[PDB]
Design a protein around this ligand. Sequence first.
Ligand SMILES: CCCCCCCCO[C@@H]1O[C@H](CO)[C@@H](O)[C@H](O)[C@H]1O
Ligand SMILES: CCCCCCCCO[C@@H]1O[C@H](CO)[C@@H](O)[C@H](O)[C@H]1O
Ligand SMILES: CCCCCCCCO[C@@H]1O[C@H](CO)[C@@H](O)[C@H](O)[C@H]1O
Ligand SMILES: CC[C@H](C)[C@H](N)C(=O)O
Ligand code: NA
Ligand code: NA
Length: 441
Amino acid sequence: GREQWASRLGFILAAMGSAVGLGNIWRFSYVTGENGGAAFLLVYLGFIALIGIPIVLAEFTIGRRAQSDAVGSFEKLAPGKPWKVAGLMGVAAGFLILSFYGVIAGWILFYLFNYITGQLWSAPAEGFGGFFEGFIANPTLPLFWQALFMIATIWIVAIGVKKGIERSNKILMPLLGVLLIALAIYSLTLGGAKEGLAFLFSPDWSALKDPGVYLAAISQAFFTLSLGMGALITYGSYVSKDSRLPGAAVSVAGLDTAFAIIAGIMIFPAVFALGLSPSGGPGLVFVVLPDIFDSIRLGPIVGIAFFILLGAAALSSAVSLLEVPVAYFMRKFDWSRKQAAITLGVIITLLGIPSSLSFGVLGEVTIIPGLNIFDSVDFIASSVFLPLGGMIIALFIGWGWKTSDALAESDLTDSVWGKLWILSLRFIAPIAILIVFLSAF
Ligand SMILES: CCCCCCCCO[C@@H]1O[C@H](CO)[C@@H](O)[C@H](O)[C@H]1O
Ligand SMILES: CCCCCCCCO[C@@H]1O[C@H](CO)[C@@H](O)[C@H](O)[C@H]1O
Ligand SMILES: CCCCCCCCO[C@@H]1O[C@H](CO)[C@@H](O)[C@H](O)[C@H]1O
Ligand SMILES: CC[C@H](C)[C@H](N)C(=O)O
Ligand code: NA
Ligand code: NA
């Protein structure tokens, strides 16, 4: 009845495209930065091995045995039991995260437009930092480019799994990796490599007595791995009988973390050479990356190449953010695919408009005490729904699955990995999440 990926690799690449997006470059930079660098990074790394690798496979496992959307996946496997709250919790993180995902993806298309028209080639008068300030504070200009991005996202989603989502131009994600390695090597010769690589790889332990860093790591880890958004459950619901689930979840985190690391090697050695502070808020990369391209001879070509490849990366990730409601509403309300995309994509766009305004006119306005609207949506989405959603997901398989079924559907045997993966779901990952919950609130 449902559409499916046309090969076992098509599922891997789509999941690779879903995972590797803006949370690798943009979000990883200013979150690693404002939380102490190397202390945070080693904690974010450790969370991906013991909380990440199991839950991605947990999501992949639950995705195909039910062959349903993220919510209906819990209704066809354990009907009547209250586990569907996790499938419900993740779709809410999809509506919330795609609202400001289109906000930051609007910044991508504006900068790309400026490099195409030859505007951001040299250092503007306002400066590479000031240019970003008067742009995110302008009430309407970010909303235009967000709507333009939400078109392609909506368009691709409305096209279909086999005619749109899976048809991602196969050679573009590798082009974004090769460039980042070439961009990482460049900033290493800007005079900030010592202050950068030390702050980014050598730990300052006193930070780990602040509990926010833990929650910050768990928030970033679940966010960069497409966890707790209902996106890995649905991408698993298009996987065929013949497929190895364990190999994909590893291939995705290894690529996402490798992409995540090179971004640190590129951003932070440049932040310390530019004399800039690593805790520069969400628009950290948009102050540094143009400042780095400004010192290259062909920097305008790099900028166009960088933002075309990073834009397509944010496009391949936000398209999957829309499938979670779309694949749900087609079942729950018999909506067609094209009707679901327009309706659910234009609402997600309007939901993010108060976030784009939180950078300028709505700066002093707060919802959650102490945070502006962008930071507040980010909190409930990425620091609550994502870490708490995976806990129920992890406890769901670990406790509410017959161990013979949990390993058979996850294509794991009774090997040490099969036990370890099961072990992390039953106890390790959920308690680490539960402990970080007790220690932050
Ligand atoms: C490419 C991998 C980089 C690994 C960086 C590990 C930590 C580097 O931090 C190092 O701390 C030392 C303290 O005096 C200094 O002498 C070094 O110059 C400094 O780079
Ligand atoms: C290239 C990938 C490996 C990078 C390993 C990073 C090494 C961690 O950094 C270490 O931090 C310690 C202070 O806490 C210092 O005493 C060590 O000299 C330093 O190597
Ligand atoms: C002092 C440095 C003056 C400019 C020397 C050019 C060296 C950088 O070279 C540039 O690096 C980019 C990747 O980083 C590539 O994409 C460009 O094609 C390449 O021209
Ligand atoms: C919302 C997260 C998106 C889908 C992607 N996982 C990223 O790291 O940017
Ligand atoms: Na992507
Ligand atoms: Na990611």
